[PDB]
Design a protein around this ligand. Sequence first.
Ligand SMILES: COC(=O)c1c(O)cccc1OCCCCCNC(=O)[C@H](Cc1ccc([C@@H]2CC(=O)NS2(=O)=O)c(Cl)c1)NS(=O)(=O)c1ccccc1
Ligand SMILES: [Mg+2]
Length: 299
Amino acid sequence: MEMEKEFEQIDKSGSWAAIYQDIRHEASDFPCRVAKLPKNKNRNRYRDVSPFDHSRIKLHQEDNDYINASLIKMEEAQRSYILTQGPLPNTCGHFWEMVWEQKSRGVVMLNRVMEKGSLKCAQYWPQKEEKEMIFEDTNLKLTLISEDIKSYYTVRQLELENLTTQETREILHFHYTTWPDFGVPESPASFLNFLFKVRESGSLSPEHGPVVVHCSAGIGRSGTFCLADTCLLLMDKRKDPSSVDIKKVLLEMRKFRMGLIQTADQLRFSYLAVIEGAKFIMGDSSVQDQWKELSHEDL
Ligand SMILES: COC(=O)c1c(O)cccc1OCCCCCNC(=O)[C@H](Cc1ccc([C@@H]2CC(=O)NS2(=O)=O)c(Cl)c1)NS(=O)(=O)c1ccccc1
Ligand SMILES: [Mg+2]
């Protein structure tokens, strides 16, 4: 596998840092004028993490259509993802408004509301069935219907309702609770077990709008998740799966949102996730159960 041969030589050379910084040096840069307007300062969690104007998600409101979110459209892979920062106390309504308007079916969360004593994202969904949420400024109601808590991730069924029309939709929430900030998953097994749970739910079907992926900034962990998923998509689609260049796929993704993949080890982890995942794509009908055992989700 050319992919694992390259992985092999990078490990031997000890050159992950240089490979990573090369991608950073070659990354696209586009303007983020809207995100930088004075009236949008309180809508961004980090001053140095903004969506490019050309790919930003526009809320349908006439007041202010701004939300720190980007549409990453991977053309050859044929999959679209919406990457956004962890909502802020004042942008939780906007966040659900975007989920509603874009017709998303699933939300992938890769961070925790509090990590190492610091708030990283607002509690934008109800933790208790009997305590539903109302986003006044948005005309939306959100209710927790049930949740399946595993050892390192949790899947939740939420009901989002447009109070105006009374239409309701089921939204699936895939929450990875043990992915350290600026770090990597415990193992490729645990990552892939989770990813294939999102795939198998139908949430990523082209019949729905783009799945919404976020972590705290929407670029480190979210970038890793999307990079691995897109490469696997491409390996299953090409006549020569060994042709997938992860570095080129990341650069293509970075055209839609800045800073995807935040450390050289998150890039190395992506190689491992893709290499391990290729086995299922190429046949292995036992790898999935192996990933399950290895990830000890029923701990
Ligand atoms: C590494 O940098 C890049 O890849 C990159 C690029 O190439 C082009 C454009 C942007 C880029 O990143 C932006 C972040 C660069 C890293 C430094 N930035 C940050 O930590 C933060 C932004 C930030 C970035 C990443 C994360 C998290 C890292 C992760 O694994 N997942 S995540 O929730 O996206 C979080 Cl929770 C926060 N901003 S700051 O506190 O106001 C701050 C400003 C200046 C110096 C220090 C801190
Ligand atoms: Mg209860």
